[PDB]
Amino acid sequence: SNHTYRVIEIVGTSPDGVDAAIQGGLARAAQTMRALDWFEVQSIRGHLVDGAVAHFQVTMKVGFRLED
Amino acid sequence: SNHTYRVIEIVGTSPDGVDAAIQGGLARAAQTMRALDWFEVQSIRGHLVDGAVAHFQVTMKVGFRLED
Amino acid sequence: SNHTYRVIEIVGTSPDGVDAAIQGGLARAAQTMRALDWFEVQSIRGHLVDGAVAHFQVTMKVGFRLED
Amino acid sequence: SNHTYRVIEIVGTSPDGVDAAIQGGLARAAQTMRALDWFEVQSIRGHLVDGAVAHFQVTMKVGFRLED
């Protein structure tokens, strides 16, 4: 058949960098979403506290296949 | 913990301007959503009728914290 | 009243071109969403197999009116 | 029939803010254009004099239906 996908936007966070934030966001998404297929980073930001990075914040679009 | 956020897109409307459209959209969003944290305006448009602005239409991304 | 809209993102697919992909995606969306009002194409991509287009993939934002 | 629209670009101005600049620009546009249907804000700028905003300047695309 011709599949249809849905694309949602999430932000993963971690003090431990860009990869960790990506992985953390996607891990949360996978808990309650099915048929995840791809992601696309929209932005990399972070929150600073006392001059240090408290959290990296990576905004992602996440695409998944819609069930019939 | 490391929080994960979800970002949805809504359009608020009002005949009474940009601020009123923002506030209206966000008020509707708050009724059913929880843990709203930020918004970002994507566009400001409007519908014209008889040469006057019938509604300002303000598209926003709205970020909220996901529950575990 | 002043209506509020929600805008989601979907990808329609078809081997039979851009229009067919748009129509297919929107047809799937219409099965489970109500009060669809507009769409906006975000991108036109496709997957190639053996040098031929296997599927056109058209990403759309789709706006609909929120119920009270 | 299948309508065709024309989209022009104007800048509305006012010392009294974004909404006033939008409304002012559109009011001028309505005097000499017919069948105005929508607008889209392109930018919000302003001119400063003696440290104060002398005019808000709101650039808009304005769409209208072409007559046959």
Next chain:
Amino acid sequence: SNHTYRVIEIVGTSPDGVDAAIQGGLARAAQTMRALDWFEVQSIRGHLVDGAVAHFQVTMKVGFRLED
């Protein structure tokens, strides 16, 4: 000589897809503008009614040579 061009923006519409909307818009443009040379699609949108595409709406920039 060194030619100068003017670029206007129009929206073509059709229920019958992207190509039909492009062709329709350009056909209307050709009736009252001369020396049309090129177009560039700016966006592909559409209006939905009862879950179906009522009109594809294709916004184009259209360039033409200015007469002396």
Next chain:
Amino acid sequence: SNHTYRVIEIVGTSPDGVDAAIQGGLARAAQTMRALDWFEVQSIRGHLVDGAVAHFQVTMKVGFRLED
């Protein structure tokens, strides 16, 4: 002479809307910068608390003439 300008980026805030945030940011800028000439809005965001807008946050580029 041929003037040179410098362009800085600031964020004005206010609970009372976009215009108030713009005006507040620019008022602060005017206290310590001279020869302010123009501004350009880069983004309109805000912070939400208990479902309400606590502050509108308007990011602006601000241009001023450099002294010799």
Next chain:
Amino acid sequence: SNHTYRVIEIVGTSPDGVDAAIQGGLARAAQTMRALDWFEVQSIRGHLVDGAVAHFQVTMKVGFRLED
């Protein structure tokens, strides 16, 4: 292994519309290239002659897998 891809840019053309231009460009690309995997449309333009579309011109990025 971890694959590496190369992305080139081509323009397909046809008087017969967007899909035909895409297909034509990709067919030419396939003649000399191997392991084509995806495309992404960058722009849709066209050349006008005597008020009619002489060619649709569809610029695409085309990704393919690099051989070792």
Next chain:
Amino acid sequence: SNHTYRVIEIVGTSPDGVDAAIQGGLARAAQTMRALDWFEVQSIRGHLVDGAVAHFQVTMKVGFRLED
């Protein structure tokens, strides 16, 4: 009063470079438009013939004050 501006798009051309193309386009514009105030370059392109630049082509937005 609060002035309203109109912004049109033109392309100036010259074999003799970017400045010459800008100046040429604007000179043509000035012949039939009044109260020209500013321009903004949108793109710099050119046509190549026998490996040489036949014309630089500079697309500009041109803003002018609307008369009452």
Next chain:
Amino acid sequence: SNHTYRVIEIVGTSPDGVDAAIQGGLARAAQTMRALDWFEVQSIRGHLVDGAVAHFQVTMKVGFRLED
């Protein structure tokens, strides 16, 4: 009160990757700036020497609260 922020642009560098470049840039910024609040990555580039990455170069906007 209603706070005002200033946003500057810096480039952090490191041979040891994106996170290291971010952290390095921000560490330098913190030495001579106060009340750092957030950053936003603008670009990730790098310099190549003998086919290897000599430095990752991460351009960031950095926002901080202005003192009264």
Next chain:
Amino acid sequence: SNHTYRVIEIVGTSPDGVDAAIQGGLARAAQTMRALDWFEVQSIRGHLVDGAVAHFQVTMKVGFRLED
């Protein structure tokens, strides 16, 4: 002399994150290209399998000096 550069686009991949994908892509590029000088990340995407990141995919522009 005045050097001329060529800029190509590649996608590096790795299951082990953004830096690893960058390094992998560039290592492949260096095998068959000479005088590599810089890169610029265009996008960070990835493929998901069973809810996990199978590969990070980092699209880069890569600039190199052309030989005479």
Next chain:
Amino acid sequence: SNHTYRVIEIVGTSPDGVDAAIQGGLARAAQTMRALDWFEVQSIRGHLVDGAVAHFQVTMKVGFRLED
């Protein structure tokens, strides 16, 4: 060591074209700044008086190395 750069934004002006505006802006910047390394043009605009270009205005980002 790993250098950190700062990037500021300036506008150079000249009646004598794009190159002259660039050179003028950068010459002013060099008078008070140290370790200038690169620039990137952001926009080319100009002010028109009596139908002629009074000043070309070239906005640049200018990067320089921060001292320890």
Next chain:
Amino acid sequence: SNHTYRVIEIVGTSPDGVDAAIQGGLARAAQTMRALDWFEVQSIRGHLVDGAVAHFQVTMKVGFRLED
């Protein structure tokens, strides 16, 4: 027939300005590519040495007709 074009990216350089950089890049391209048809400037940058512009660097897309 329906022609297909290929679009490559090059950077021309010169100490003598934007036009000279464009012309230099294109002259180098013409030595080893055939059927050059158009260019589009992507960016204007430069390298600064001792406070002066050592080279203007103009990145261009260059389109050419593919042979059968």
